[PDB]
Amino acid sequence: TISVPQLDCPLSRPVHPEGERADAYAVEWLRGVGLMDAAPVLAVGLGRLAACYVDENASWDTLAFMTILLAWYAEYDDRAIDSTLTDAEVAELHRALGEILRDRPAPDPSDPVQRGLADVWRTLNGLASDWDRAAFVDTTLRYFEANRYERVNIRRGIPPTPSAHIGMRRHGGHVYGMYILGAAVNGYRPERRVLDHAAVRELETLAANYTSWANDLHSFAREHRMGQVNNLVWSVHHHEGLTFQQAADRVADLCDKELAAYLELRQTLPELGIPLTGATGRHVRFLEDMMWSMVDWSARSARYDVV
């Protein structure tokens, strides 16, 4: 067995009240769309994560789209990346899903993932709010390429160097795309003058690092049973020669240090000329949400139980 370390995050946030309802809605959508007994899915709690990602006074339509998006993400990652399909099949799937992102109809309406992604795209564009869709599509392309990289690593059966995994994981979790979608769906648009600043980019990188290392720390057991070798705990144990417990301890230590660096940069931001006032403030707060979201939600989700 393994002992999951604790993660002190000085960032708290209230959850949306209809979370349980969204859980039910999640199953409905999947069964209504064709991606999929309904009480092992309610235990995962895809609607409560969505509740962590939306504002407290948000419409059922918005919270519903958040639940739909997180449910589609969970199905693609598990179905296509780490529960193996051939590489050619995966490449054609990437092409087809990229075509849906090109506003064309689904090339294979019989594929459940393709229909689901078309639904997600239509629903997202309905609550447009005037967002940079092209940047989101670019992050999605990098996400697909990183998925292919992960599948290569799984086929070899050995974890990459910690540096190589840490680099590619930011694309493999599509965290930057989640930042873009959060800006789109909630109703704030940060200036392009601010986002292209080096300090903001490195702050985003720190926050994404914290989120992804926390996710690895919590999901290590399920990812090890399935053979998903793209885990920071895996690589630390393999290349630094440490026990799984020592590896998890080292990863939690790295999480702590990255959080400290994140706070240091956030405090330095005003002096450089970037005030955390308007859309910049809500963007930084969204960055803070995903870090707390992993710590609080992963311990409450039935994704990681091995019962």
Least distance to Mg ion from the beta carbon of 277, Å?
31
Residue 223 marked as a ligand binder = yes
SS3 content of the chain, % helix, strand, coil (to 5): 70, 0, 30
Which residues inside 211-270 make contact with Mg ion, applying CB under 5 A?
Answer: 215, 219
Least distance to a copy of itself from the beta carbon of 18, Å?
36
Residue with tokens 């795209």: 121
In one-letter notation, the amino acid at residue 104 is: R
Which residues inside 131-160 make contact with a copy of itself, applying CB under 8 A?
Answer: 138, 141-142, 145-146, 148-149, 152-153, 160
Question: Between 60-76 and 19-33, two packed helices, what is the crossing angle to 10 degrees?
Answer: 60
Least distance to a copy of itself from the beta carbon of 259, Å?
9
CA distance 244 to 264: 30
CA distance 103 to 114: 13
In angstroms, what CA-CA distances link 253 with 5, 6, 66, 246?
A: 10, 10, 31, 10
Q: Is 145 left (phi over 0), alpha (psi -120 to 50) or beta?
A: alpha
Residue 235 marked as a ligand binder = no
Residues binding ligand 212 (CB under 6 A): 73, 77, 173-174, 215, 219, 303
Question: Between 175-186 and 60-76, two packed helices, what is the crossing angle to 10 degrees?
Answer: 160
Decide: helix, strand or coil at residue 164. helix
Least distance to a copy of itself from the beta carbon of 240, Å?
9
Residue 44 binding partner per list a copy of itself, ligand 212, Mg ion, none, with a CB distance cut-off of 5 to 8 Å that depends on partner kind:
none
Residue 77 marked as a ligand binder = yes
Ranked by CB distance to Mg ion, the top (closest) residue is 219
Residue with tokens 């919590």: 218
Copy the structure tokens of residue 6: 């604790």
Q: Which is nearer to a copy of itself, 67 or 280 (CB)?
A: 280
Q: Which is nearer to ligand 212, 232 or 284 (CB)?
A: 232
Least distance to a copy of itself from the beta carbon of 272, Å?
6
DSSP state of 130: S
Which residues inside 270-289 make contact with a copy of itself, applying CB under 8 A?
Answer: 271-273
CB 214 within 8 A of CB 291: yes
Contact call for residue 163 and a copy of itself (CB under 8 A): yes
CA distance 81 to 83: 6
Contact call for residue 77 and Mg ion (CB under 5 A): yes
Residue 89: how many other CB atoms lie within 10 Å: 11
Ranked by CB distance to ligand 212, the top (closest) residue is 219
In angstroms, what CA-CA distances link 70 with 27, 34, 76, 287?
A: 12, 16, 10, 17
Number of residues that bind a copy of itself (CB under 8 A): 37
Residue 138 binding partner per list ligand 212, Mg ion, a copy of itself, none, with a CB distance cut-off of 5 to 8 Å that depends on partner kind:
a copy of itself
Residue 215 marked as a ligand binder = yes
Least distance to Mg ion from the beta carbon of 226, Å?
8
User: What does the per-residue mask of binding to a copy of itself show for 11-30, with x meaning CB under 8 A?
Assistant: --------------------
The answer for residues whose C-beta is within 8 angstroms of residue 252's C-beta and 6 or more apart is 5, 6, 7, 217
Residues that bind a copy of itself (CB under 8 A): 138, 141-142, 145-146, 148-149, 152-153, 160-164, 167-168, 171, 196-199, 201-202, 205-206, 209, 257-258, 260-262, 264-265, 268, 271-273
Annotated binding site for Mg(2+): 77, 215, 219, 223
Annotated binding site: 77, 215, 219, 223
